[PDB]
């Protein structure tokens, strides 16, 4: 007997890790064919889930914690001889303290720095390894959590875009309340 977990989470690490690779300058990829078509009226088109959630998250991590982010970016230097067990160490201390969205989305960028630090000294072939060591330990410390709070489509819809914009609204209101109460 045996089991296994879906692959959502691992779309997440290549989503993002990229995206944290863009924004350091960085990209690479490749191309392929496969079959569809279209008619309508193509352009950018953004959606407003994970993706999109995750990221912003990922930005402002660093930017309210600036210094709780570099300070740990620095106690894990990855390389070809680095054992995914040094890694999983480091993580589990960082999320010690139970599990919370925030130490989840922090989380998540301690990895982009990782990539950001392999490309630097041109070891881009790392990030294929720390990305699949990341939907190794999501699927095996994260997942179970993740499934007990309602997914990521509570994280969309607390700390997400839609979710920002949602907040406000009330806000607005419940001010305009006091005011003509
Ligand atoms: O923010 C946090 N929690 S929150 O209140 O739930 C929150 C607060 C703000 C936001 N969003 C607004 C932007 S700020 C933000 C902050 C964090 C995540 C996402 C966004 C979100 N969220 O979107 O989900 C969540 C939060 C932030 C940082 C840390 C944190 C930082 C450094 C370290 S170093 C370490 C182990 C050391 C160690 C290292 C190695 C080996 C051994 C020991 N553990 C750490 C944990 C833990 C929790």
Request: net charge negative; hydrophobic share 35%.
């Amino acid at each position: 007997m045996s089991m296994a977990m879906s692959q959502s989470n691992r779309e997440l690490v290549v989503d993002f890790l990229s995206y944290k690779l863009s924004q350091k300058g960085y990209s690479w990829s490749q191309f392929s064919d496969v079959e569809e078509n279209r008619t309508e009226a193509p352009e950018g088109t953004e959606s407003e889930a994970v993706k999109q959630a995750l990221r912003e998250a990922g930005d402002e991590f660093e930017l309210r914690y600036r210094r709780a982010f570099s300070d740990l970016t620095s106690q894990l230097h990855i390389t070809p001889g680095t054992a995914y067990q040094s890694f999983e160490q480091v993580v589990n201390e960082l999320f010690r303290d139970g599990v919370n969205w925030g130490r989840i989305v922090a989380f998540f960028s301690f990895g982009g720095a990782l990539c950001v630090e392999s490309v630097d000294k041109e070891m881009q072939v790392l990030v294929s390894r720390i990305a699949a060591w990341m939907a190794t330990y999501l699927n095996d410390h994260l997942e179970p959590w993740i499934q007990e709070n309602g997914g990521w489509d509570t994280f969309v819809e607390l700390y997400g875009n839609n979710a920002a914009a949602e907040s406000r609204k009330g806000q607005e209101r419940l001010e305009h309340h006091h005011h003509h109460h």
